[PDB]
Amino acid sequence: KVFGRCELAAAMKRHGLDNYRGYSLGNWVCAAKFESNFNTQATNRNTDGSTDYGILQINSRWWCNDGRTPGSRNLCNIPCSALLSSDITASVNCAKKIVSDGNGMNAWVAWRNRCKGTDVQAWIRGCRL
């Protein structure tokens, strides 16, 4: 499923991401836009053999199990496929643990390079939340 901007903002909000660990909603939406282009089915393989999955591109080296990333952990206790569902619940739940991991949102490279320190409120502008 390809989300629309405001539809994703409302889904994230409903799933408690707005101001989770101090990150306003706009951060989360901006991260998603640059990580997956709002596409829940997005996948990208890393040079170390791990793969990033979903709307928030969660990495199989630490967070989910894909059965082909040797020596990886599965901290979110989910198959990585769960991250690709049209229902974002699994993605949000695992994201909440990632952002609590200590580095905050800096865990998401696109966030750090493209969202951080920008006017993130713009990503939720015009939405009915």
Side-chain angles (χ1 to χ4, degrees):
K1 177 182 171 168
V2 181
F3 273 85
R5 178 172 67 75
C6 300
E7 182 188 21
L8 176 65
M12 283 180 158
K13 187 153 177 284
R14 222 231 318 164
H15 283 90
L17 283 187
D18 188 21
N19 310 299
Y20 191 77
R21 292 289 158 148
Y23 297 85
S24 67
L25 198 57
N27 291 281
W28 296 110
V29 171
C30 182
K33 171 64 185 174
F34 296 121
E35 282 295 345
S36 73
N37 206 20
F38 294 149
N39 184 1
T40 62
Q41 299 199 76
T43 56
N44 288 102
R45 191 86 199 253
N46 301 127
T47 58
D48 69 354
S50 66
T51 297
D52 296 340
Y53 297 80
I55 206 159
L56 290 169
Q57 289 293 276
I58 290 173
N59 181 267
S60 69
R61 174 79 59 212
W62 316 99
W63 308 100
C64 61
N65 183 41
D66 66 9
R68 64 166 195 199
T69 312
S72 69
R73 295 258 273 166
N74 176 5
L75 298 180
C76 291
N77 264 289
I78 48 164
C80 299
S81 55
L83 299 172
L84 303 180
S85 176
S86 48
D87 184 325
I88 68 173
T89 304
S91 279
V92 167
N93 290 346
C94 183
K96 283 185 177 161
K97 293 192 183 68
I98 295 172
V99 73
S100 291
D101 189 56
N103 308 290
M105 282 200 70
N106 294 298
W108 285 276
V109 178
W111 176 80
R112 195 198 324 131
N113 288 334
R114 308 187 64 181
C115 298
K116 188 170 191 174
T118 65
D119 183 28
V120 295
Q121 195 277 321
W123 290 101
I124 61 173
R125 65 85 176 47
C127 314
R128 183 166 39 229
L129 275 329

